[PDB]
Design a protein around this ligand. Structure first.
Ligand SMILES: C[C@@H]1CCCC[C@@H]1Oc1cccc(-c2nc3cc(C(N)=[NH2+])c(F)cc3[nH]2)c1[O-]
Lengths: 246, 9
């Protein structure tokens, strides 16, 4: 996250941190995710596409720091990894960039509710906030495009949803953005999501509930004028989510 | 207690 504030997981208790195990001993961060129900975390297919070996990933809930432990955290193995058939990447965009991870602890259980572990709500079919709505994004991604390391402390920021007409202007992203995506930016192009924030949540209050409106997917640069962050439009994937979460 | 989506405590 470029800009934003440092925060703790109590402020984003549905945030899930996904890591990958390496032969040699290191575990590295992959992407963020969101807890939708006790056993399911939703993220982005591009986070796994290149290495779809579920056994090598670790999911943690209740984590405020990247490589140190947080009291209350829960560790899970990925029982199922569901990628979107029809996911496609082009020169910038990722299409149908949504994935589901079914989690299981070493004791055979799913997540348990706590002050640091909570689920986020799903929107109703094709229902979105209107542009102009402020939503929050959270993640362990870069703090500056030139950094080569991720922050140790979780960050969060606020961005506003913008219209498809504005995002699809030739000097923004043109037709690269589809109706299955959402764009959000800071009015002053000061804060934004960046590499490392992929898979994480775009949360907005919708009909009184804090709702998972988008999944951080792509963007050209980070906090660049006329280059908003693009997110997978969750409201348009409800049938797909239901199909695998029944 | 149990999950209540969207609630921070
Ligand atoms: C594709 C691999 C899978 C394993 C490690 C993460 C990596 O994923 C990525 C590799 C390179 C860049 C990104 C990435 N660029 C991003 C740019 C933005 C933005 N709004 N400016 C964003 F929100 C997320 C991004 N995520 C990204 O998610």
């Amino acid at each position: 996250i470029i800009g934003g504030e440092f925060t703790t997981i109590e402020n984003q208790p549905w945030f899930a941190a996904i890591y990958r195990r390496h032969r040699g001993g290191s575990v590295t961060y992959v992407c963020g995710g969101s807890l939708m129900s006790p056993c399911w975390v939703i993220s982005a297919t591009h986070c796994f596409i290149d290495y779809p070996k579920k056994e090598d990933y670790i999911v943690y809930l209740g984590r405020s720091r990247l490589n140190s432990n947080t009291q209350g955290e829960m560790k899970f193995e990925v029982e199922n990894l569901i990628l979107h058939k029809d996911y496609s990447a082009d020169t910038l965009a990722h299409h149908n960039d949504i994935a589901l991870l079914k989690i299981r602890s070493k004791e055979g259980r799913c997540a348990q509710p706590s002050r640091t572990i909570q689920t986020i709500c799903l929107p109703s079919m094709y229902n979105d906030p209107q542009f102009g709505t402020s939503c929050e994004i959270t993640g362990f991604g870069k703090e500056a495009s030139t950094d080569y390391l991720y922050p140790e402390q979780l960050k969060m920021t606020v961005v506003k949803l913008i219209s498809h007409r504005e995002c699809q202007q030739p000097h923004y992203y043109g037709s690269e953005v589809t109706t299955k995506m959402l764009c959000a930016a800071d009015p002053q192009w000061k804060t934004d999501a960046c590499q490392g924030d992929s898979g994480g949540p775009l949360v907005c209050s919708l009909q009184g509930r804090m709702t998972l409106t988008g999944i951080v997917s792509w963007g050209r640069g980070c906090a660049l004028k006329d280059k908003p962050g693009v997110y997978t439009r969750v409201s348009h994937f409800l049938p797909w989510i239901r199909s695998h979460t029944k | 207690l149990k999950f209540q989506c969207g609630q921070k405590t």
